[PDB]
Design a protein around this ligand. Structure first.
Ligand code: A1IOF
Length: 128
């Protein structure tokens, strides 16, 4: 399924080239701008542990998810991944624990050493 497709076909968007954040563009967005640290960013997302054992979605809350890029509100993989996205883009990310919750995990939702999958739609972004 989608996690294994990102393993096989995803681009490694990490600086270290350690395959810690792998990306597929599923729907192309518009415009030249991409989100930058400090921007206020508006998304919809669907996430899950890569083995399907827990799910989460902005739609569960009936509203976009909003965060400030690079402000420590999201996991490192989102700061890295969403900064590559254009307005309107849908992307898939597959994420190693080093760019998510690590060996400590984040119980009860996130076990130690968890790999994460997200589908993210970038709705909008604004400067601080
Ligand atoms: C570890 O705790 C949670 C993880 C995740 C979602 C959670 C968590 O409980 C606080 O609740 C959903 C609502 C309440 O919060 C949204 C964003 C939270 C924050 O931005 C942090 C905690 O989340 C993240 O950094 C990432 C990226 C943004 C969207 C949420 N995401 C998660 O890791 C999910 C996670 C995804 C895989 C399945 C389990 C939930």
């Amino acid at each position: 399924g989608a996690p294994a497709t990102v393993t096989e076909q995803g681009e490694d968007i990490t600086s270290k080239k350690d395959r810690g954040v792998l990306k597929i563009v599923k729907r192309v967005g518009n415009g030249e701008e991409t989100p930058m640290i400090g921007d206020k960013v508006y998304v919809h997302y669907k996430g899950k542990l890569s083995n399907g054992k827990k799910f989460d979605s902005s739609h569960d809350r009936n509203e976009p998810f909003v965060f400030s890029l690079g402000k420590g509100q999201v996991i490192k993989a989102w700061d890295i991944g969403v900064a590559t996205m254009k307005k309107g883009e849908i992307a898939h990310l597959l994420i190693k624990p080093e760019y998510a919750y690590g060996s400590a995990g984040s119980l009860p939702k996130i076990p130690s050493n968890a790999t994460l999958f997200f589908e993210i739609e970038l709705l909008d972004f604004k400067g601080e």
